[PDB]
Amino acid sequence: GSRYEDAYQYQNIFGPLVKLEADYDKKLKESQTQDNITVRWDLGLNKKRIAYFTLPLMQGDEICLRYKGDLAPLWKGIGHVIKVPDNYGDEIAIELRSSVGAPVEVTHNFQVDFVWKSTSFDRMQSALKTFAVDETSVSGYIYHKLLGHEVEDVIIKCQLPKRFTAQGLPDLNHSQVYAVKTVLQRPLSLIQGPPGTGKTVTSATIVYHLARQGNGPVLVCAPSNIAVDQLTEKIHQTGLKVVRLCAKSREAIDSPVSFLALHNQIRNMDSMPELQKLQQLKDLSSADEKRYRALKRTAERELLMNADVICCTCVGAGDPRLAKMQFRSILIDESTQATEPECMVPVVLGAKQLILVGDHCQLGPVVMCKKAAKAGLSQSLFERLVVLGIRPIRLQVQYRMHPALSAFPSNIFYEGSLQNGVTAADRVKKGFDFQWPQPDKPMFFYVTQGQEEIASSGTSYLNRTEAANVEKITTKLLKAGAKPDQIGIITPYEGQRSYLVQYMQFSGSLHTKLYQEVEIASVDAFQGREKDFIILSCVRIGFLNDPRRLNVALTRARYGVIIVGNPKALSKQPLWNHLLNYYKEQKVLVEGPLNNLRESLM
């Protein structure tokens, strides 16, 4: 199978895969350069200059603004993004690191360059090298297991808790008790967590018990900053001392766990007086600067080494500030959303016990370079271990959706093993006068008989008439009660996206402020997320090709899903024909005007 004979071969194969995607990312980013750009200058209340502009991306990313004009400036300046193009406008916004000599005077002939950073790629490469050359990087049993070698099982002989539920978190259910129990006694384990089944509550519980033992700080990571914040919050609810490690650039940002950030916890220490004043002084002196970094370093080191838990994105585990720290226990949440070299960044920090939590029946790792993806980069560590025979313990109680919405996804994607920790009356809105075709089934496939073109732009599709019908659905949910920001429109094409945002503006029944808050995106953007109501626009790639994309799209909703597509055309994909026939049995493949809904017979 996907079995390696040693770590040198393992590096020999994954290392090149990382190089492929690192340069692909580089070239791509360099090709995003645009010229003849109009700017709009401003001044934030911090005195840091902000610059606005539109282009023919993610918060924190660095852009490089160059003025190339006839006048006597000719200036370069780097800043970081603070607003990306969304429902408000196609505009972008950056804040300059040093606004001393910014040409606020001019505003016409600028060039924008997206600054490529090697950091993540360098750390993945370095991680692989460590896995080959440093034998202290993983226990040996872990080494044999990751390489697909057949070694006898091992049981960790820890002190088991009498009660598995942790202080401050919800009461564990049977599948979760089984998972936390089993996992504390195994040097390596996978937990599969279907939508809403308590991946993060469970993870948080496991770290509680691993931190309640006589060993060092638990390392806890995840691929996205969002995923790490959510786990950081839950760990904090259990009374443990947690430290959130932020990337230097992202340090400037406000989350629900901003007080937990290391750089903030340092800006508040009674034990370090001389440090406080120096930070309260650059509001810089050469001799004061050497004392400031020596102290900041001393402080980081204390908070880090005496924390019960260090929370970190996978790539962020390579942080220098975590220099020469080993971590006995490591847990990676949302792990099936990382590439294997990404996960190995934390793993090689001395792992004796590893727990991967994720779901290989939902979306996999994002991989730009197609050639690297097909060669193996798109398979997560979690998935490869499953292929090698490591069976995941499954969390089978879902606390997200109306039992009706869970039926189809559970049956086709989860061997019908799921159970509902919420009932129908737990997920029915109050005073909500939006009448469904079938009262106790908050769902229906609206039969839209609409045409699809290829809007003059490039290679992207859009269903013009389907977009109109989705607007009507959205208008009905809003004037029936539902808040705008609890309505998600999911579609597989960027053409439908752009056409939808602009169609709910040029000619919508209500003002563009209600629709501005309605989030429109592909399934990719919606992973690990939920809304009360989900409208699906299948304009005829995306959630109609990959079985896993359909699973994710059908499990975002809490209170109701409404699919809008052409039944005749979608029947071509096998998965959709089954979906359509099932909606028909439950009597929710409806047709006609929204206000007098009936029942199709196609």
Ligand X SMILES: Nc1ncnc2c1ncn2[C@@H]1O[C@H](COP(=O)(O)OP(=O)(O)O)[C@@H](O)[C@H]1O
Question: Distance between CA atoms of 204 and 191, rounded to whole angstroms?
Answer: 13
Return the closest-CA partner of residue 271 out of 296, 290, 299, 294.
299
Q: Give all strands (DSSP E) within 383-501, no chain letters.
A: 393-394, 397-398, 419-420, 443-447, 452-453, 462-463, 487-490
For ligand X, the closer of residues 171 and 288 by Cβ is 171
Q: Does 362 belong to an annotated binding site?
A: yes
Which residue reads 């939006």 in tokens? 434
Question: What's the min distance (Å) between Cβ of 167 and Mg ion?
Answer: 20
Taking contact as CB under 5 A, which single stretch among the options 106-114, 195-203, 305-313, 435-443 is the one that binds Mg ion?
A: 195-203
Among 77, 148, 198, 217, binds ligand X (CB under 6 A): 198
For Mg ion, the closer of residues 200 and 313 by Cβ is 200
For ligand X, the closer of residues 139 and 173 by Cβ is 173
Among 6, 171, 289, 302, binds ligand X (CB under 6 A): 171
Which residue reads 């505003």 in tokens? 107
Question: Distance between CA atoms of 83 and 53, rounded to whole angstroms?
Answer: 11
Residues 253-312 that bind ligand X (CB under 6 A): none
Q: Give all strands (DSSP E) within 303-423, no chain letters.
A: 309-313, 329-332, 353-358, 393-394, 397-398, 419-420
Among 139, 200, 205, 566, binds ligand X (CB under 6 A): 200
Instruction: Choose the one of ligand X, Mg ion, none that binds residue 552, judging by a C-beta under 5 to 8 angstroms depending on kind.
Output: none
For ligand X, the closer of residues 198 and 365 by Cβ is 198
Taking contact as CB under 6 A, which single stretch among the options 191-199, 277-285, 456-464, 481-489 is the one that binds ligand X?
A: 191-199
Question: What's the min distance (Å) between Cβ of 237 and ligand X?
Answer: 11
Q: Which residues, listed in sequence order, are joined to residue 81 by a DSSP beta bridge? A: 94
Q: Under a CB-based contact definition with an 8 Å cutoff, are residues 401 and 358 in contact?
A: no
| 409 counts as binding ligand X under rule CB under 6 A | no
For Mg ion, the closer of residues 7 and 221 by Cβ is 221
Q: Does 196 belong to an annotated binding site?
A: yes
Q: Coil, strand or helix: which one is 277?
A: helix
Residue 340 has φ and ψ, to the nearest 5°, of -60, -50
Q: Does 176 belong to an annotated binding site?
A: yes
Question: What's the min distance (Å) between Cβ of 217 and Mg ion?
Answer: 22
| 201 counts as binding ligand X under rule CB under 6 A | yes
Residue 383 CB partners (closer than 8 Å, separation 6+): 336, 360, 364
For Mg ion, the closer of residues 296 and 531 by Cβ is 531
Q: Does 399 belong to an annotated binding site?
A: yes
Pairing type for strands 34-37 and 110-114 reads antiparallel
Among 11, 120, 125, 176, binds ligand X (CB under 6 A): 176
Return the closest-CA partner of residue 453 out of 439, 444, 464.
464
Question: Distance between CA atoms of 459 and 320, rounded to whole angstroms?
Answer: 43
| 346 counts as binding ligand X under rule CB under 6 A | no
Q: Under a CB-based contact definition with an 8 Å cutoff, are residues 362 and 548 in contact?
A: yes
Tokens of 94: 């950056």
Question: What's the min distance (Å) between Cβ of 201 and Mg ion?
Answer: 9
Instruction: Choose the one of ligand X, Mg ion, none that binds residue 216, judging by a C-beta under 5 to 8 angstroms depending on kind.
Output: none
For ligand X, the closer of residues 147 and 201 by Cβ is 201
Q: Determine how many CB atoms are found less than 10 A away from the CB of residue 59.
A: 15
Binding mask 347-386 for ligand X (x = CB under 6 A): ----------------------------------------
Q: Under a CB-based contact definition with an 8 Å cutoff, are residues 161 and 208 in contact?
A: no
Tokens of 531: 């809304």
Q: Does 584 belong to an annotated binding site?
A: no
Among 52, 178, 399, 436, binds ligand X (CB under 6 A): 399
Question: What's the min distance (Å) between Cβ of 321 and Mg ion?
Answer: 26
Question: What's the min distance (Å) between Cβ of 504 and ligand X?
Answer: 29
Binding mask 196-225 for Mg ion (x = CB under 5 A): ---xx-------------------------
Taking contact as CB under 5 A, which single stretch among the options 44-52, 194-202, 217-225, 487-495 is the one that binds Mg ion?
A: 194-202
| 173 counts as binding ligand X under rule CB under 6 A | yes
For ligand X, the closer of residues 179 and 386 by Cβ is 179
Q: Which residues, listed in sequence order, are joined to residue 62 by a DSSP beta bridge? A: 80
Tokens of 412: 């086709």
Residue type at 570 in one-letter notation:
L
Instruction: Choose the one of ligand X, Mg ion, none that binds residue 537, judging by a C-beta under 5 to 8 angstroms depending on kind.
Output: none
For Mg ion, the closer of residues 230 and 406 by Cβ is 230
Taking contact as CB under 6 A, which single stretch among the options 167-175, 249-257, 439-447, 476-484 is the one that binds ligand X?
A: 167-175
For Mg ion, the closer of residues 80 and 360 by Cβ is 360
Question: What's the min distance (Å) between Cβ of 200 and Mg ion?
Answer: 4
Sign of torsion over alpha carbons 20, 22, 26, 28: positive
Q: Coil, strand or helix: which one is 304?
A: helix
Question: Distance between CA atoms of 561 and 401, rounded to whole angstroms?
Answer: 10
Among 172, 220, 348, 361, binds ligand X (CB under 6 A): 172
Alpha helices in 306-418 (DSSP H): 340-347, 370-372, 381-387, 403-413
Residue 270 CB partners (closer than 8 Å, separation 6+): none
* Half-sphere exposure for 336 (CA within 13 Å, toward CB): 23
Q: Determine how many CB atoms are found less than 10 A away from the CB of residue 307.
A: 22
Size of the site for Mg ion (CB under 5 A): 2
Question: Which residues here bind Mg ion, judged by CB under 5 A?
Answer: 199-200
Which residues line the annotated binding site for ATP? 176, 196-200, 362, 399, 530
Which residues line the annotated binding site? 176, 196-200, 362, 399, 530
Question: Which residues here bind ligand X, judged by CB under 6 A?
Answer: 170-173, 176, 193, 196-201, 399
